[PDB]
Scaffold this active site. Structure first.
Site, PDB file in Angstrom:
ATOM      1  N   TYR A   1      40.781  34.585  39.601  1.00 16.49           N
ATOM      2  CA  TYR A   1      39.160  33.819  40.210  1.00 16.49           C
ATOM      3  C   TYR A   1      38.669  34.960  40.516  1.00 16.49           C
ATOM      4  CZ  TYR A   1      37.056  32.759  44.926  1.00 16.49           C
ATOM      5  OH  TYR A   1      36.088  32.596  45.334  1.00 16.49           O
TER       6      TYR A   1
ATOM      7  N   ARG B   1      39.509  43.116  52.629  1.00 16.77           N
ATOM      8  CA  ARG B   1      38.569  43.166  54.029  1.00 16.77           C
ATOM      9  C   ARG B   1      38.152  41.978  54.709  1.00 16.77           C
ATOM     10  NH1 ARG B   1      33.562  45.412  54.997  1.00 16.77           N
ATOM     11  NH2 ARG B   1      33.178  44.019  53.544  1.00 16.77           N
TER      12      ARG B   1
ATOM     13  N   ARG C   1      39.631  29.209  53.758  1.00 14.96           N
ATOM     14  CA  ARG C   1      39.570  29.837  52.530  1.00 14.96           C
ATOM     15  C   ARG C   1      40.451  31.152  52.892  1.00 14.96           C
ATOM     16  NH1 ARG C   1      35.115  33.262  51.797  1.00 14.96           N
ATOM     17  NH2 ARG C   1      34.034  31.610  49.998  1.00 14.96           N
TER      18      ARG C   1
ATOM     19  N   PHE D   1      23.058  51.169  40.995  1.00 13.91           N
ATOM     20  CA  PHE D   1      23.091  50.556  41.362  1.00 13.91           C
ATOM     21  C   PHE D   1      24.440  49.888  40.715  1.00 13.91           C
ATOM     22  CE2 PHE D   1      23.754  45.844  38.705  1.00 13.91           C
ATOM     23  CZ  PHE D   1      23.027  45.392  39.179  1.00 13.91           C
TER      24      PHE D   1
HETATM   25  C1  LIG Z   1      28.078  46.722  37.569  1.00 19.23           C
HETATM   26  C2  LIG Z   1      29.874  45.929  37.265  1.00 19.23           C
HETATM   27  C3  LIG Z   1      29.928  45.082  37.766  1.00 19.23           C
HETATM   28  C4  LIG Z   1      29.471  44.501  39.055  1.00 19.23           C
HETATM   29  N1  LIG Z   1      30.302  42.964  39.700  1.00 19.23           N
HETATM   30  C5  LIG Z   1      28.987  43.337  41.081  1.00 19.23           C
HETATM   31  C6  LIG Z   1      27.935  44.695  40.613  1.00 19.23           C
HETATM   32  C7  LIG Z   1      28.586  45.640  40.000  1.00 19.23           C
HETATM   33  C8  LIG Z   1      27.899  46.676  38.946  1.00 19.23           C
END
Ligand SMILES: c1ccc2[nH]ccc2c1
Length: 349
Positions: A145, A192, A202, A262
């Site tokens: 999942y 969490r 869920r 990121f």
């Molecule tokens: C890099 C790799 C996998 C990821 N899943 C959610 C954000 C993210 C960033």
């Protein structure tokens, strides 16, 4: 010179990803719009899959076919319940389609493939739920999942990174790395949010784990079982922590700074959230979050380099290592994984 289609996609980006929209919008311009399109497409998928007012007869085809809708100018959808949070993304989805088609062909193939694979996994899940139990019973199911709702996001992002030469191409030959990326985040949130999710009927915790601690899943939230509940979450945390080293492996393969930020920010936040939840009984009563001073430190420590991020991981692995108590049936295995994380970071840095 921003087109209104672009402004809308960024507006919806603010409204769906909330705080994360800021780091997405700092992405290098080669992937800024692609990643934005990718997120709004997956968010559009979630808005369909989560609306229980859409019958399976309608919902399942939309999920399996959504990859083809990305190619239809002006595609809209107004069949969400009038109160779904992200309705308007699908009614104004023609902006996502416009920007999807403006994407470089390599980016469109990646997003379309992931949309296709993900939407069908969702449709399979939505079907079983209507005609069966769909309860997570095994760790393997649990991991499956997570691969569909999070591991596939990792595949798509990695494919965009490698295509833009922002990631070492070897990241595609070791798909366990981007899988660990997505599973580390998804498992931390599943841990969490366990009370919140259970109060919405869920349940994602595998019975293979929680059955060793309680007779029924609902028993975890009764105050008299708080001890076994902690032990159960401990094994949940242990299972999540097994991905952390492969996450450090993946971040080492990123070659562009905004792409590093990121990917590194959610990982550092996940391990901090895991440490806050470890042996914390509040996790079963409410939704607990890391403090604002901590989150602000983490954001600085996840927007520098791999060395700084690894020190953050080492710090929270040590915090979990110290909270680990022999009263826990998972005591030894928690210490071992924490030690492997710490000793691995010590070897790099
Ligand atoms: C890099 C790799 C996998 C990821 N899943 C959610 C954000 C993210 C960033």
């Amino acid at each position: 010179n921003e087109t209104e289609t672009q402004k809308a996609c960024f507006k919806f980006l603010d409204l769906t990803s909330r705080s994360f929209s800021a780091v997405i919008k700092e992405l290098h311009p080669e992937l800024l719009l692609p990643v934005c399109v990718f997120y709004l497409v997956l968010r559009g998928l979630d808005t369909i899959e989560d609306d229980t007012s859409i019958p399976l007869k309608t919902k399942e085809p939309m999920l399996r076919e959504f990859k083809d809708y990305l190619e239809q100018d002006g595609w809209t959808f107004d069949g969400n319940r009038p109160e779904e949070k992200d309705r308007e993304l699908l009614v104004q989805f023609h902006n996502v389609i416009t920007e999807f088609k403006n994407m470089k062909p390599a980016y469109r193939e990646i997003v379309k493939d992931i949309t296709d694979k993900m939407g069908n996994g969702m449709a399979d899940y939505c079907r079983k739920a209507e005609f069966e139990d769909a309860s997570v019973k095994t760790i393997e199911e649990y991991d499956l999942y997570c691969y569909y709702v999070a591991g596939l996001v990792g595949e798509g992002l990695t494919r965009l990174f490698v295509e833009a030469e922002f990631g070492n191409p070897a990241l595609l030959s070791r798909p366990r790395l981007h899988k660990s990326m997505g599973l580390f985040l998804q498992k931390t949130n599943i841990i969490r949010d366990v009370r919140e999710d259970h109060d919405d009927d869920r349940h994602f915790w595998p019975k293979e784990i929680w059955s060793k601690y309680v007779t029924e899943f609902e028993d975890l939230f009764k105050p008299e079982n708080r001890e076994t509940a902690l032990n159960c979450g401990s094994e949940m945390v242990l299972n999540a922590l097994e991905h952390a080293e492969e996450c450090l492996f993946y971040l080492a393969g990123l070659r562009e700074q905004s792409v590093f930020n990121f990917c590194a920010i959610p990982q550092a936040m996940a391990i901090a959230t895991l440490e806050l939840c470890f042996r914390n009984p509040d996790m079963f009563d409410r939704n607990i979050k890391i403090t604002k001073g901590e989150a602000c430190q983490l954001m600085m420590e996840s927007t520098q380099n791999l060395h700084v991020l690894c020190d953050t991981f080492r710090r929270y692995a040590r915090r979990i290592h110290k909270k680990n108590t022999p009263k826990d049936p998972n005591f030894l295995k928690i210490s071992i994984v924490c030690g492997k994380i710490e000793k691995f970071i010590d070897t790099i840095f």
